[PDB]
């Protein structure tokens, strides 16, 4: 149960500059980023152990993303994963690893949460960049649709009803919530 609120708010300003979000909405969003992080992290670890690797790389994040996410989300996630990893690899450094990856979401904390409790695998540098990029992309997608629902309701901020309606009304988000809340 990491708080991603500040990073969610930054992504919300990127995609709906003039839209707010309610504290109950922000809680659901954090719950959602946690569930997604765990499901992808869990699957990547299993993939490495099954194929008896001693490390989680962006390859195992990539496979996990392709297994868990519906098709269009998976394609955009893979695109955003590879772009963030590539930016970071040729980055100018002298900045947060997130700033090198061109992301708002925190690479360090994703690194920390990929290692904690493992004891059977090391975490590559690309793996947490790829996964932060994917968390950022799926946040942007949810907030885009949630903010569109707030506008239809003539509201200036996102409330829980907007997240519910954006998820039920979008084929891929509705399908994804099957694997993620379990």
């Amino acid at each position: 149960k990491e708080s991603y609120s500040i990073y969610v708010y930054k992504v919300l300003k990127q995609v709906h500059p003039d839209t707010g979000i309610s504290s109950k909405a922000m809680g659901i969003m954090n719950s959602f980023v946690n569930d997604i992080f765990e499901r992808i992290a869990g699957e990547a670890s299993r993939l490495a152990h099954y194929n008896k690797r001693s490390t989680i790389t962006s390859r195992e994040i990539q496979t996990a993303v392709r297994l868990l996410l519906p098709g269009e989300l998976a394609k955009h996630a893979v695109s955003e994963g590879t772009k963030a990893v590539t930016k970071y690899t040729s980055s100018k450094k002298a900045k947060t690893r997130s700033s090198r990856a061109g992301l708002q979401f925190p690479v360090g904390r994703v690194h920390r949460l990929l290692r904690k409790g493992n004891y059977s695998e090391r975490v590559g540098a690309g793996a947490p960049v790829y996964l932060a990029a994917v968390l950022e992309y799926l946040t942007a997608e949810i907030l885009e649709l949630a903010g569109n629902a707030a506008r239809d309701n003539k509201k200036t901020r996102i409330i829980p009803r907007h997240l519910q309606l954006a998820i039920r009304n979008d084929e891929e988000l509705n399908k994804l919530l099957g694997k993620v809340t379990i």
Binding site: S5, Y9, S22, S23, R157
Partner: peptide, 7 residues
């Protein structure tokens, strides 16, 4: 009774 999140 659900106030806006601000940073």
């Amino acid at each position: 009774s659900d106030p806006s999140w601000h940073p």
